[PDB]
Design a protein around this ligand. Structure first.
Ligand SMILES: *Cc1c(COP(=O)(O)O)cnc(C)c1O
Ligand SMILES: *Cc1c(COP(=O)(O)O)cnc(C)c1O
Lengths: 364, 364
């Protein structure tokens, strides 16, 4: 059908008459929600008006395509409150771009990126007192678009819902340090494949990972290292992008991450780390496949400095151990500082919390 | 956690006070629903009691894991009403087995197969007058299990819902004949992969196929032929299993379907066709990979008799054309009768509608 969008200019506001009490000083990820949400409905008449409304349950027809055929996508981004109580979102335009790409892949309706962003801004503004301001804390923003056609046909939905909910989040690390994780690298489990949809933030990519994460824990590891292809390409760690800081086989010190060739989700943090490192101009920055054979050889030769994951949840997450083919591989990230990881963490903290002004931050 | 199940002995019944009018003489697949549904809730206290209740909307928390991370699975099976008004389900035990396998893969709670089946039986019994009895018609039964934890953690759900809804379905073919379809075979699109979850009936497998089906239609084809691997293995057609009746390269007449090696959904119809053909003992019946190279050579040599899909929707669906690498390949299914397809259709019709007694049918 023809494209159309809702407009922020049309936003309707209904304030809660029953606010929840705000948390004390233990923000467990994803279990505590704020007082309001955004909601917009789409059908054959286009989008309705956007509304901010009290946090409340969804009412869905039992045949809703969202629940049968996974016509569902989401985003995640963080807002941060500085010491002056100004709230700012980190590169939210990138998340909007990604959400629209996801929507098109599932034949869900398009909308105007900047109108959604302005609605999100207004929502956060209404719930601004829910954004924590202790060091390292944040507000997680969770936009969702679902198909909502009351039909068991596997087909393009004629109805959809877009909604956004918000969660306060606690700190992951003490100021100025990081704590590493151990990974399970089992080639039997495949997250994504070329020709598939692992490069979109679709619900369907995440459910099948629950059992695998439980196998990692059973095995004494914290997260999953996702391997791909017959050469055991390192793709992602958990729900994070993977980076390696090493001297490569050609003798050149570089930061490498896998290229966007279909099996990598294009992270916002990932893009930001690449951008920052390119701007410093201190070492080579490249997008290239990384194989277990290359890593094993680099480790034995002492060429690896730091391996880490990146994503909205911890920002940068160091790795100290990989369990592969029943071999426990020590990764010397913490013995190398981890200088690069701490550098990234510091620069992101300064930008996100407004210690210095930067074009990446969108004020609320 | 420890396993437990709901019991049919505990079923609660609430009859509708506002029945819907039943359809006239146009049953469009999946859009018309019956007066009641089954519902069972699970949490940390185990399963609640099962209930038959009037058809109504679901009320879900906006953070429900079913909508964010695709913690969702479903089944599909048919009930058939004979000319004596007896209603019978086709091999429903197989669907129960498959549903439990799906549940375990997504870390959703197990339940007792026969208790669910007995509840389903009771539901169909309450809505028995909704089962059509015109030739070729049926009642589709749609069990669903979803995670329902109000949490944005990607984790094993601590709450779930199991529900079943029912749809009357019309006939697909006139009695005693079949109509063929054209397929798009584009190796760029991959349904499933070894190491993945394409062998389970999980919602997440279906949403990404909507865009691909639209590309097939844009290309002048009706359904998608799903190819896998660098040798272009024929895996599935649409949401159906694929069968080929041919003289193989060794000179032997056989019926072949791809083996259950991770990328094939184990269809109930598929299993039934294999069982029937094995019981006749007239030709070789084998599970072997089928490649496009083999098919192309077989076609040019005149060795192909019939290619068809199998599944609960049409039972057997003949193929007459495959568009591959921009070549339109004629498939001579209709020129060969299609004798085998008509044989299968007749034998299934006799069993499903109770013309002859058979252990595959479960009386309601
Ligand atoms: C969300 C996600 C990432 C990280 O994306 P960010 O935008 O940096 O938060 C990486 N990989 C997967 C698989 C993800 O879902
Ligand atoms: C449901 C389905 C089938 C067919 O299964 P039946 O049990 O015969 O209805 C085959 N392939 C896919 C991908 C399916 O979803």
């Amino acid at each position: 059908g023809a494209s159309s969008s809702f407009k922020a200019a049309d936003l309707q506001l209904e304030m809660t008459q029953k606010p929840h009490k705000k948390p004390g000083p233990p923000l467990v990820f994803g279990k505590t929600f704020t007082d309001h949400m955004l909601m917009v409905e789409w059908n054959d008449k286009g989008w309705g008006q956007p509304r901010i409304q009290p946090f409340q349950n969804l009412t869905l027809h039992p045949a809703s395509s969202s629940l049968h055929y996974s016509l569902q996508l989401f985003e995640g981004m963080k807002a941060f409150k500085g010491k002056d109580q100004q709230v700012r979102l980190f590169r939210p335009w990138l998340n909007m771009d990604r959400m629209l790409r996801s929507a098109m892949r599932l034949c869900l309706p398009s909308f105007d990126k900047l109108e959604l962003l302005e609605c999100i801004r207004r929502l956060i503004e209404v719930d601004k007192d829910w954004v924590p301001d202790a060091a390292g804390t944040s507000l997680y923003v969770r936009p969702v678009l679902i198909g909502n056609e009351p039909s068991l046909g596997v087909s393009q939905p004629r109805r959809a819902l877009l909604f956004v909910i918000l969660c306060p989040v606690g700190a992951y690390f003490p100021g100025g340090s990081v704590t590493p994780v151990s990974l399970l690298a089992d080639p039997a489990f495949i997250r994504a494949w070329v020709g598939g949809v692992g490069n979109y933030k679709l619900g369907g990519n995440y459910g099948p990972t629950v059992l695998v994460q439980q196998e990692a824990l059973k095995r004494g590891c914290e997260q999953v290292l996702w391997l791909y292809g017959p050469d055991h390409q390192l793709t992602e760690v958990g729900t994070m992008n993977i980076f390696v800081y090493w001297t490569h086989e050609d003798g050149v010190l570089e930061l490498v991450t896998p290229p966007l060739n279909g099996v990598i989700l294009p992270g916002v943090v990932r893009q930001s780390l690449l951008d920052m490192a390119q701007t410093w101009g201190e070492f080579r920055v490249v997008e290239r496949t990384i194989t277990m054979k290359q890593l094993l050889r680099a480790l034995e030769e002492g060429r690896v400095r730091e391996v880490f994951g990146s994503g909205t949840a911890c920002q940068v997450c160091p790795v100290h151990r990989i369990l592969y083919k029943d071999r426990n591989l020590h990764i010397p990230t913490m013995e190398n500082g981890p200088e690069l990881i701490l550098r990234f963490q510091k620069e992101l903290k300064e930008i996100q919390y407004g210690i210095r002004a930067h074009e990446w931050m969108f004020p609320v």
